[PDB]
Amino acid sequence: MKFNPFVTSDRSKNRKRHFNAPSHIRRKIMSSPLSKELRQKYNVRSMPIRKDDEVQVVRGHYKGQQIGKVVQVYRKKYVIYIERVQREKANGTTVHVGIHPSKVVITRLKLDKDRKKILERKAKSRQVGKEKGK
């Protein structure tokens, strides 16, 4: 259950809050998980996906093992486009098929100073949870 009386559980209110969420919040929503190799190393479940993190699609038609680079994130549409995840139109021109971050998995992050620090935060607050539970 939830217990906090300033939170919702309220189909409509959640949905509005999701659909009318703004971009910096949609960063958090369009997060995707880290493959088990990384998960071990960084001690992090998941990371807000980004422009050029390599990625395996897990569910859908394009479902495979083929580690594509994300091309671009379309936070308007809650969806990412991925290197080779694409389909021909009628006139031949290719088109990136929108994939939803949650059905994907990060296989190589695009580490910069900021991202590194985030993963350092998540590890830290994880291990504090583990130390509290012990």
């Binding site: 259950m1 559980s9 309220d10 189909r11």
Partner: protein, 258 residues
């Protein structure tokens, strides 16, 4: 409904004589809505018949003494496994039906502990069933935060929370009731009398104090006894083929003249 609903026009009824139909009609304009009929519960737009009020009598009230009687009945048929089984509670391998557990259970602080307790008492099948029942509700409830639905599983009557109620919490189906603060709505859900229950010595010993024997007050609810029984030997099979009755009966005329 809102008071206003339907009265936010200036509808004069065109009189008779202009053919048509004597409703109050939306005065004026070159809109569509321009003599469309208003107010009348038949009219689109219009105003619902005998609108709903807040000051309808929603709440109801019940004598204290009855409520207690109710809660007794309920606790009585928490025993009597037939009833509990008829109320569905899968209670086949349970050991002794006022089912009381040591009071190390009072202070578990983890679900796992709780779940293993249930499996050792063999209640777990009830939960197992709760899980299974979990399915979607049919109809407009869905669009009103009553979207998933399931069984009621075992109750757990605890004397004091030393943790426990945290431990049994995510386990779906389970309720917890303090004994000193019982509740019918939970002991007899749907107003159906049987319920599978798990008591905790301390709570279970506190019952006689809470409701009294027959030959002692509650001693906790001021001035209260358990109710009386109107007929003692409920089992009338035994009565009917007693000596004393079947001595004195005319013999059974059972031939059939057609």
């Amino acid at each position: 409904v809102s008071e206003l609903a339907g009265h936010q026009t200036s509808a004069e009824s065109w009189g008779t004589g202009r053919a048509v139909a004597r409703i109050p009609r939306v005065r004026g304009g070159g809109t569509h809505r321009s003599g469309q009929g208003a107010f009348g519960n038949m009219c689109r737009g219009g105003r619902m018949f005998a609108p709903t009020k807040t000051w309808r009598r929603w709440h109801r009230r019940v004598n204290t003494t009855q409520k207690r009687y109710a809660i007794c009945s309920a606790l009585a048929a928490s025993a009597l496994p037939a009833l509990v089984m008829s109320k569905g509670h899968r209670i086949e391998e349970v050991p002794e039906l006022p089912l009381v557990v040591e009071d190390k259970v009072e202070g578990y602080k983890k679900t796992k502990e709780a779940v293993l307790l249930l499996k050792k008492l063999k209640a777990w099948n009830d939960i197992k069933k709760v899980y299974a029942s979990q399915r979607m509700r049919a109809g407009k409830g869905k669009m009103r935060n009553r979207r998933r639905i399931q069984r009621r599983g075992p109750c757990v009557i605890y004397n004091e929370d030393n943790g426990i109620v945290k431990a049994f919490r995510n386990i779906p189906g389970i309720t917890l009731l303090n004994v000193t603060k019982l509740n019918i709505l939970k002991l007899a859900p749907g107003g159906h009398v049987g319920r599978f229950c798990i008591w905790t010595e301390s709570a279970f010993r506190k019952l006689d104090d809470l409701y009294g024997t027959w030959r002692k007050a509650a001693s906790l609810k001021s001035n209260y006894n358990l109710p009386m029984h109107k007929m003692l030997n409920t089992d009338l099979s035994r009565i009917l083929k007693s000596p004393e009755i079947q001595r004195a009966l005319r013999a059974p005329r059972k031939k059939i003249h057609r």
